[PDB]
Design an enzyme around this catalytic site. Structure first.
Site, PDB file in Angstrom:
ATOM      1  CG  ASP A   1     -19.460  42.545  15.970  1.00 49.26           C
ATOM      2  OD1 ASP A   1     -18.227  42.711  15.992  1.00 49.26           O
ATOM      3  OD2 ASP A   1     -20.061  42.294  14.910  1.00 49.26           O
TER       4      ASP A   1
ATOM      5  CB  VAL B   1     -18.366  29.956  19.512  1.00 49.00           C
ATOM      6  CG1 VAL B   1     -16.872  30.024  19.445  1.00 49.00           C
ATOM      7  CG2 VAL B   1     -18.925  31.306  19.886  1.00 49.00           C
TER       8      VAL B   1
ATOM      9  CD  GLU C   1     -27.272  55.722   3.919  1.00 51.01           C
ATOM     10  OE1 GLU C   1     -26.710  54.629   3.696  1.00 51.01           O
ATOM     11  OE2 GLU C   1     -28.509  55.880   3.825  1.00 51.01           O
TER      12      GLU C   1
END
Length: 716
Positions: free
Chosen positions: A508, A716, A546
């Protein structure tokens, strides 16, 4: 399992729509340009457009020369076809209005649920199809300022909690432009300014710029009133598509994409497969054009055998192994079921005791509290001799809905946890609590080395056992146990399956700066046996451009794993992420492919797409060259299943990419990877947890590498 024919939300387009002559050009942006010119955009960076009319734009452009439709890549043909459907009156604006003729906006409290359709074109085997997908927006009927009772504090309180999904529509603008509030990077702190000069200017900007007439001004003050100089200005960027705009709460209403995200509302936005089927048919029959089919398309899907749904089993202390899917004299005992783990973290071997906290929401009815304490006591018992079947209780009651009670809870627990390594909390909370308060209670207890499990009032009142109202459903009990065990890294299940990989990795990407850190994302690892073994943070330096140096990101992934006792060198891995594997991510993966001789198998895993199959069953099918997979059905909840879209698969060896093709084998891998939910009351486990973790890091969760080293899903 055989095959079947299912109706999908696609309607075939007539080829007579394909343009005769297309004009190319090189360089109200480039997109608006093409658009107004009834055309699209061939090359992003190079500024290359493709119109179906003679380009009207007295500017820096070079007429490259006419082109024939067959020349544009599929995507552009589809994008071009889409633009052309619009010209025939077949666009989101129009069809959304047709939709609302049968599915009207409904108001709930201060909010309105607005139905509309999302449209796109998909080229499938030489043919183009229009996907018409029904969606909803939840827009506040009151302005943000009114909504928060014109209180500066309460306002900042709003942007913070709703930060992740909040959007603000400028209802004072004739364009109704939607914006996204800005937040001080790496913070829940929203960019604000109480400078009345900013408030006045921009409030004035609106009147001068859009309502310059006496009546218009009358309306404006009637609608919005004078300028409340007591309101701060909210710094924001457009939500569409580096540049910031100022918004005045008094003039903006909060909005939300329903699908992206409240019982009442939810019961309106979730539509059964037949309801979606029908509404689309209603829209079509209202569409006056033979440029598209009158009926919804049907496609042949592959049903997923029910067997592939039993490859995950749990066992008891005897020899009873059963697939996670659900008289005897003992059936009267409240004793929780017995689960004999296949593996238990080696950490629990040394650990002395383990404090057990029963946190009761004082707002729950006494009988509900009593019930919960009894359920948890039984849960703890099975919890034990589960953690050591192969080889104290503090009850806290506070108002979990007030900030003062949460503090007293954490303090009272902090008190008993001093000196201890691991603690457990079983919490009974009213459904009123916001995610925020739930996330804070949980995170604050973890800083104290206390893993927790929440059971809400709902579960406690509507999930009781048929033969004993003073006991939870056997189904729910099992799931509570699986959740706790997963949060503790216990391999409580076994998978009758083997992935043809060394490790399956979910990553992620999410920038965050942590006290001595500056983290770029996360990665979670599963072994070929289907178990979670490593959950690592991915620290990076202060990024240059960026973008994010994915080369650095992926290199640190390997290094961080090597440190966590896993070397991906000369190994074959399946690397997945939430969404399309971007170019930077591809290069980053090629880099790490040579530098460590890693055979990287990756593909796009897309959960946010509009394609829908109006059938409620496990299946998969090929559409437009991508695979759509429905991993499971729905038994209680109302709604239409959301397929996981699989596409653009590649194999990466020694920095070389070989575009590939998805096999029934790949589909089976995602399938099983998706079946791993750990008893949660949509994405492949690896990807799903990387995300939950990247989220934990951005919410300040403590980072126990001792726990993550063995897969504790404590966040989680």
């Amino acid at each position: 399992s055989m095959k079947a024919i299912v109706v999908i939300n696609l309607v075939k387009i007539n080829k007579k729509i394909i343009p005769d002559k297309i004009y190319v050009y090189r360089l109200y942006s480039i997109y608006r340009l093409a658009y107004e010119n009834v055309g699209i955009v061939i090359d992003p960076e190079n500024l290359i457009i493709a119109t179906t009319k003679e380009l009207e734009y007295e500017g820096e452009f070079i007429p490259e020369g006419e082109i024939s439709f067959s020349e544009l890549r599929n995507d552009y043909q589809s994008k071009l076809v889409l633009r052309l459907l619009k010209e025939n009156g077949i666009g989101e604006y129009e069809l959304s209005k047709l939709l609302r003729k049968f599915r009207k906006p409904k108001t709930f409290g201060d909010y309105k649920v607005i139905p509309s359709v999302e449209m796109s074109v998909i080229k499938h085997d030489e043919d183009f199809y229009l996907v018409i997908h029904i969606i909803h927006q939840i827009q506040s009927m009151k302005t943000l300022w009114e909504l928060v009772n014109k209180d500066p504090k309460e306002l900042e309180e709003f942007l913070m909690t709703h930060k992740e999904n909040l959007m603000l529509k400028d209802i004072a603008s004739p364009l109704k432009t939607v914006y996204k509030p800005c937040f001080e990077e790496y913070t829940k702190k929203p960019k604000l300014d109480h400078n009345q000069e900013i408030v006045k200017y921009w409030y004035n900007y609106h009147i001068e710029r859009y309502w310059n007439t006496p009546e218009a001004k009358l309306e404006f003050y009637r609608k919005f009133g004078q300028v409340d100089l007591k309101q701060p200005a909210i710094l924001a960027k457009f939500a569409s598509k580096n540049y910031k705009i100022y918004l005045l709460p008094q003039l903006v209403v909060p909005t939300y994409n329903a699908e992206q995200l409240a019982k009442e509302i939810l019961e309106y936005t979730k539509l059964m497969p037949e309801e979606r089927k029908e509404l689309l048919e209603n829209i079509l029959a209202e569409v006056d054009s033979d440029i598209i089919d009158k009926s919804l398309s049907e496609i042949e899907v592959e049903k997923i055998a029910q067997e592939l749904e039993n490859k995950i089993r749990v066992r008891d202390d005897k020899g009873n192994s059963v697939p996670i899917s659900q008289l005897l004299w003992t059936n009267y005992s409240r004793k929780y079921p017995v689960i004999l783990p296949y593996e238990v973290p080696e950490k629990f071997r040394k650990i002395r005791e383990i404090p057990m906290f029963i946190i009761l929401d004082s707002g729950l009815l006494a009988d509900i509290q009593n019930f919960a304490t009894n359920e948890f006591r039984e849960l703890v018992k099975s919890m034990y001799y589960s953690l050591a079947k192969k080889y104290k209780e503090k009850v806290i009651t506070e108002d979990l809905n007030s900030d003062k009670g949460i503090i007293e809870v954490v303090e009272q627990v902090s008190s008993f946890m001093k000196g201890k390594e691991l603690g457990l909390a079983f919490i009974a909370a009213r459904n009123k609590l916001s995610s925020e308060k739930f996330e804070e209670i949980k995170r604050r207890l973890f800083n104290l080395n206390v893993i927790s499990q929440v059971v809400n009032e709902d579960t406690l009142k509507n999930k009781r056992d048929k033969y004993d109202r003073n006991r939870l459903d056997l189904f729910v009990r099992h799931n509570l146990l699986f959740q706790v065990l997963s949060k503790l890294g216990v391999k409580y299940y076994v998978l009758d399956y083997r992935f043809n990989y060394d490790y399956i990795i979910g990553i992620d990407v999410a920038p965050m700066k942590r006290s001595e850190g500056y983290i770029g994302g996360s990665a979670v690892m599963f072994d070929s046996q289907g178990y979670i073994r490593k959950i690592v943070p991915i620290k990076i330096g202060e990024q240059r451009g960026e973008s994010v140096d994915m080369n650095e990101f992926f290199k640190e992934m390997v290094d961080k794993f090597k440190e966590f006792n896993i070397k991906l060198d000369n190994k074959k891995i399946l690397l997945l992420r939430d969404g399309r594997i971007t170019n930077n991510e591809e290069e980053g993966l090629k880099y790490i492919s040579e530098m460590f001789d890693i055979e990287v198998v990756t593909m796009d895993v897309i959960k946010n797409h509009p394609v829908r199959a109006f059938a409620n069953m496990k299946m998969y099918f090929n559409l437009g060259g991508a695979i759509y997979l429905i991993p499971h059905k729905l038994k209680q909840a109302k709604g239409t299943p959301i397929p996981i879209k699989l596409a653009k698969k590649r194999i990466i060896k020694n920095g070389k990419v070989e575009k590939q093709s998805i096999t029934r084998q790949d589909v089976l891998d995602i399938f099983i990877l998706t079946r791993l939910n750990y008893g949660s009351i949509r994405l492949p486990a690896p990807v799903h947890y990387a995300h939950k973790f990247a989220n934990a890091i951005r919410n300040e969760w403590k980072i126990k590498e001792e726990f993550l080293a063995e897969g504790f899903l404590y966040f989680v």
